[model samples]
Target: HMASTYLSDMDWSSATHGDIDKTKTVQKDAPFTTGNKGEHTKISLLTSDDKVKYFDKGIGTVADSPSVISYDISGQGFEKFETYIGIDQSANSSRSDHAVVDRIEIEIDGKVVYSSSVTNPEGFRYNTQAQFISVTIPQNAKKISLKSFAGEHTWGDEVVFADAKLIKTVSTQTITPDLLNKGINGGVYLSDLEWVDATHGDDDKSKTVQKDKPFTPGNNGSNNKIKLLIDGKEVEFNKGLGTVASNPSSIKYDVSGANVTRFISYVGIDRSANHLNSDYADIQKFEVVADGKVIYSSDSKYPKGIKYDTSAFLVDVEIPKDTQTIELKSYSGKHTWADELVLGGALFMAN
Candidate 1:
């Protein structure tokens, strides 16, 4: 797997709760008793450590009595759900506290994966350190949720989930043989095309270039694989070939006598360039060369392959007559990140 798709990094498709407050850098130094609003939508929350950290992709919310947050994870190929359960530092700092036990539960497709109790004791100035929880999502699960229940008492049970996220070991989709046979708009995938050989900078080209799989001449930073992401979410392109790779580094494909007349694809810079604080990404260009002639070229101003609109571009170019091979390559933007290049679903078409 390239990189996990964190639940915190994604926007929940739907949520139903009394008051889903999106907290700022810190949870207010107060307690929420019964039907209290909290920071759940997104957040910057203080842990029990009192250091006031945990923001962006972190969850610190008040789950008053009965609260639940749901996401449409159907067919998303998520592997597990993970988070730390606890009462925010605000709860520990608050002087008012009777006693409330928060029953935190995580569900995958309505199946409870994990359930635990977080007790915010009655004593004044009690501490409830967040604890890690993880549960595997059943194969082919449809929906997932995070829930909190503080019993019948309508008061005294405020809780939060920190670093709440889902781990995606597999992608939401895969390429089928039928899909290989009939690609988007009748175009055949370059990966599906018959290849006599393939090479990229002395690196072995054995991997068939599948989704979530490693490719040759890959970067160690991104696990040598590319996730076609934009704004931290893997994008979906109606015209995307359903294949992805990163930093082919002048890779060449041998499609000799494949009867293909065109090479087309969507190329872009993956959002992972800045992952793990690497801070590496810059201008890059793409080229589609056939038979040693540059038939298609693109400047470094490409989009991030976002599904919203024209954030992604399609490179469609004709192959000259009697062309023997094609090259799907990129010119570096002058950085070690290799421009964080992402090859989004390339295809070979014939008229």
Candidate 2:
């Protein structure tokens, strides 16, 4: 969404022929001919001898020739400008000569966008009395100019921009995929199995072996003993698996109101002994169930003989949108020794 942006106070040092100092105050009779105070009282009281004048106090100008001030508004990304101008009432007394601005003009890109020439009904004499104006900026407009004509009097007839700013509109939001779970049903555990983090083969520098001595090939797909890769390189499930009993071990995950697309995992057998075990060397079954029904089955998809190898099998399954709970299970074969399966990493994609 687009939003409005306000401009800071104008820097008057760049203005032409003006007392750019903001701290100094203007006198009621300063900048005019001597002994001419209160000489003009009527509206639009322009005298032939009146001349243009500029003051730095709060960025103001007085003139019979129309005092002009400009600002560089390029690349501001604004659609319009709102301006406020006021007379400096603190510089004069109640008995001092009245001041009024006969006309004001706003220009954008060298072209006038708004102009008004109206008499101040109540005149301008009190501090904070103001006039507001607005103008739409044309596409690619850069420079903006403000021109004011002091009604007849150039003394104590100062006008200033009290406020100036730009306007835009509100902008929209976006969403991206985020990680929801990692490692075995979102880090849950099964009673029959214990989790371990260790390397396999020559990579196991710690001299710690989980199952049989580490197999040389490479843990799962990488050099690590028990590691899982969810996406190409999104997350690494370095947490290895522990020994499992003869019974099957299961892990469950709940995904409700999610734009789940697919489930992925890397599975293999670890330990050199598990690869050599005659009866328990091969995996009996590996299954993925969505809700209650099995969405993927190693028995039906890859057929048996799934044994311990340096590398693991990549299991990628599409999940139905309506499915809520997801379950992963590994069943034991004949012997329990090294029958344990290594689930490197398990992950799923959702909205």
Candidate 3:
């Protein structure tokens, strides 16, 4: 089923009338009465130059001011609705006085369902930009009316509903016991491990290194084997067999514990020494596979030719529920020297 029904989808004539004087108050190009519900549907009071100017702490604008606007939505089969209210940046281009709403109320089937007052500091105000409000519709509603009353603001009180719409309820599953939460024990690292010379075997053998230690703002050497750094504890890579050209290095996990639906991880090249190594393990690509079938790849995660300096980026992919064996594979980079990619963290969720 569709998720939402925009209020603008209804005929403009169907909306309830208000005290707004169309000729005097509303903008011609951007009317407050009817239009697509989006950030672009802005409204403002007409000024001498059709613009609001700030002087000291006061505002200068046209004489006529608008106070209220209301709408009726009864036939729309929506369980909830949301709308953004704010001053029109176009109308008040230069300066803006905080616009506030004295009252906002929602009625369903002739009965009030929601009501609120937005005033100064405690109430809703467009101090700078627009804000959003969401409300749940009552059950078996035959009619719904939304009315908003403007506060006494002289300058930018002219408010508009930005993308008001009715929304359908959606059901979603919650997956707990994230496999990545298990850290090192959640999976097994394979032999494809490689790292920069300054970081791999001799320079720093510490299984776990903080992002600030050697790799400050940028350049953190990669780990030879799969290493786990959780909280403040670091676990060295001990599972994978020796690397062989015939087989690629990978991290495999048994999904028999839970029905998995998605896998997310932060991965990027570790250039710890800040100096390019001739023999660096420059990996070209990485992949996530389930039961030998490729499910996701790094080709789409990071921008092409963009190199990672200090922190790794995030990558997420949806996997099948029946997935049994999940594998994280790193393909060899341009130079086998130290082109190593690291999985800073990983998460697996179920649907």
Candidate 4:
């Protein structure tokens, strides 16, 4: 039972089965139309025609000249579902002759979707099966149509087709948490501290500390490598025991064994070669080393540049956190003056 029908001049078997059993030419003047949504259509020859004949149980046998014919279906809302077409050739047709099909065009919603042409296969005289040509289901499609090209000289039998079927499909979310929070600044910490040179002073009063002084080796020199005494003992410098510089430099303190978490020390510079620029200078570089590694360092730019023309004074350096040892070295010039170097700082450990 198809939704549409057409006119054909041929001997068809049944409406459910689009089959022909004859050896003559047939033509389909009126084609079925699927003019509405959810609609299907099919057709078949009901009675025998002069162009075709059939034999039953070896009697009433009639065979005419073979020809070709075509079939098609068209309608609206046809592109919303999957469509199909089934065709078959009569079994009694010539094995050498075949049908030629072409000029197929299908449009949906005023838009063309499918179109093609193809000739039938040879030695298929007894074929009784339908072939599905094509199917199209577009989202914006509203109407559809189908048509075939004219046949050639080679003749076969009447063409056959069945109703097309359509089915609807379901539609389904498309973002994430990590993309929302970026560079928010949540966790952070502080690590170290430093100290700069200020106004000059000494341990006691009366003796004003000047920038540079004058003298010999055992006397006063502009630059001198002074030593620092921590607690009751003296703190070490660079290589052996430690190191010291005439200019401005830092000294290292070994904190392995100590009473409290913090310690204090004092520094003094020996100014003997006071007048020689390259002989004994006052510039220095100070640093702290721990476990054979440097932890902190600084320069004595303030006091090291002062000359002997004024008073002799030294710069006070404050130790920062996470420091282990202090080291001081001469930078600009040599300190021929005996003890023209000095340093002092306190080490406070965590409780």
Candidate 5:
């Protein structure tokens, strides 16, 4: 059973801040009738359907110029966030002139992931479709911010966040997924090549791991597995690459003859890093090096207070043309043993 949290049940008072004068409304089974100014009416926002999307569960607020509502969602195991964005149907005909611009934005940690202002100019009628978005939330994320922008509006021009849903992260059993010859987004997968050398303090010193086999090296419940958590979800890669161990680790590969010029991977800190004590560990730093010179580093990505980055940060760095040997390095920020970093879906690519 998956945990599904609805916005109607969320505590609105927990909001840190909201733009302008706010009157938050969380309604259930709302009728399809006209609402007052600064309010929303339950109308079908989907144009491709025959049924009216009463939005059995919905929330609304007065639309303003940059109406931002942000909430702190830290420590919650929510992996994904989704919702529908639309405007009130009782608005004036000025929208037909494309004068009303309603911009909807979904932000995680102040980073805008999804934005929509396209259909609002088409006019807010039952035939006009609303934007539906579902985005993955990283574990290190701090805030879940929602926003709506409006330049011109009339009565009932409020923005309605229909069916705001939070999908919880379920810790499923670990199952290694075969990633060999698989299609990655940007470049080649790490499993497609062989590692030349590797160096670590305590763990088994082997070539790049997860290429042909799994490298399970860690302490306690975090050890003996490669299904690490990225964005609060367990990612099982059967043919991927990972150190699967702690920081202060390095693995080198020879791509000189392969004509590869890029190093790409989703680097992250394990949630188990803070298993002992929150204050014990700070953060983990990731770096990519070519021939001894540091090509890219995570010093700027993992700031001071970002101790628990349970998700992944894509490492896409350029490798030198004369690079004969490239290495992947992971280092502990403050504590040594408490640091467990992972190079998920690590890869080497050209162009």
Candidate 6:
């Protein structure tokens, strides 16, 4: 544990919701600070999207303002430990989402180990049950800190934290070979449940949508035209098919996005043209070429993997390692096809 004067003095004039009576006041670095002062040294009160006011003397009658303090666990000691937290309800205001302890996060070393958003209806502050948690410490970690964000609903912008202690174990036995190999028996229980807000991210990564085209094939082999897509770009096929050898025919494509972890090749097969009412014609062979090397190949000799029906068939092709360009080839054995393709997936890089 370390001490600093910044944590010792209280800025009572900065109080928001209720009056700051002479007796009911907080001290700056007092012997026992409320929240995680070992980490963040100061707390701020404010409204959503509003600037934080640390020393503004005119916040007289604002009721539902929020007060927050974020501790810096970037430094401190004890990599893995457990403790109890206490708060005084008398000094803080309350509201629906307003946290008596709106939220708390325990970060080990630097990564978050345990975190919770608490809402209590007791109308008063109370001690929280003991909870255990662990943190990760990188080889160079030197210090740790805890930050707290607390305040009331509308009436006042103030919070009171009390009885904050880092608990110590009473065990004194040393590890021995017998104890190392033996397992302890016991029942387990959990307490002090808390909530946390969710994170956000993009939903879709489909490449065909980026090319400004819909990947759909018409009713039957009557249209028999399919365009293959590679890394979101369309690859034109050979006009006349005699093994597609000269232009290396199957369709050619590329992957360009840096964050893409994989590449996607879209293949559409429309058999409407061969409406013989019988499953006579099928895709005889399908193959993918990367840098002149074939990465995947399939023959119509087996019908197990390929499904043949009246509806449009969609096939996806995955990119191979270190591949810059990809080519798609398909041989029709008396079958009519509606050719359309799309690209999708992420790409990876070497360190």
- The C-alpha stretches of model 4 lying farther than 4 A from their native spots are 1-86, 95-98, 109-111, 116-130, 153-157, 169-351
Each candidate's root-mean-square deviation in Å?
19.6, 16.6, 18.5, 31.5, 13.7, 22.0
Give candidate 1 regions above 4 Å deviation: 16-53, 96-99, 118-126, 152-158, 170-173, 176-351
Whole-structure CA lDDT of model 3: 0.45
Per-residue lDDT of candidate 6, residues 54-107 (tens digit): 321111111222332222323233234332222322223344443344444444
lDDT of each: 0.51, 0.50, 0.45, 0.30, 0.57, 0.31
Worst 10 residues of 6 by lDDT: 187-196
List residue ranges in candidate 6 displaced over 4 A: 1-249, 253-266, 279-281, 292-310, 317-322, 334-351
Leading candidate by lDDT: 5
TM-score of every prediction relative to native: 0.40, 0.35, 0.35, 0.23, 0.41, 0.29
| Candidate numbers sorted by TM-score from highest down | 5, 1, 3, 2, 6, 4
The reply for model 3, stretches above 4 Å from the true place, is 1-247, 273-281, 300-311
Q: On a 0 to 100 scale, what is the lDDT of residue 168 in model 1?
A: 68
Structure candidate 5, residue pairs in collision: 177-237, 177-238, 179-239, 231-311
**Candidate 2 Cα misplacement greater than 4 A, ranges:** 1-13, 17-59, 93-98, 118-129, 170-351
The digit string of per-residue lDDT tens for model 3 on 1-351 reads: 448766555533223323244444322234333322223343433234444322111111121122323345554456886765444444333443444445555566667665654422343454434445687876565565555555465443444555567787543223212333344333322222222111222133343222212222122343344433332334332222222111255656777666777765655554332235343334456678889998877667543422333244455678887777877766654444343455543555566
Evaluated against the true structure, the overall lDDT of model 5 is 0.57
RMSD of 4: 31.5
Tally clashes: model 6.
43
**Steric overlap count per candidate:** 2, 10, 20, 49, 4, 43
